[PDB]
Amino acid sequence: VNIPPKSLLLVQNDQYVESEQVIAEIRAGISTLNFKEKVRKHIYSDSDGE
Amino acid sequence: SKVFLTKHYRNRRAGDPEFALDFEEIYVIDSKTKSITRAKVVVTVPGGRNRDRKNDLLVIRDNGTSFKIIPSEERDDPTTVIEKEEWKKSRQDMERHLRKLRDFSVSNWF
């Protein structure tokens, strides 16, 4: 199985996989609605220092 | 979809006191291919040609493509063949559903 326009293959050659494991992503090649929202996440320091 | 033409035995009339049908000569008429062919009958009954053609039963299967001549004593009641086909289809479907589990190939079908 595979999809030609957009396939993201998350696995390598000669790799042993079990059932019901995500192998590829169709990537939803069909375009998403273009409502881009940009959000600002802040990283917080866990410990003190320089 | 198909029309079967069964030739009578020795071209006898239906009103004859000893009437029979010849299953070795059956002509099908297809409707999708506009073709008229012969039926590849499989005569499986002990007796050969010396056996009287009064104890016979043509069984048609596989969408009118399989023909078998068997005696009328070893026939199958409708419920038997219905249950046979249902059991086969159900087992195929069950093996399909279970094949997609990781615990397969180490299991048993009880």
Automatic annotation (TrEMBL), chain B:
> This chain belongs to which protein, by name?
PLASTID TRANSCRIPTIONALLY ACTIVE protein 6, chloroplastic
Designated gene of the protein = LOC107789386
Domain of life according to the entry? Eukaryota
Species of origin: Nicotiana tabacum (Common tobacco)
What lineage, starting at the top, does this entry show? Eukaryota, Viridiplantae, Streptophyta, Embryophyta, Tracheophyta
Q: Which residues of the full protein are shown?
A: 222 to 331 of 331
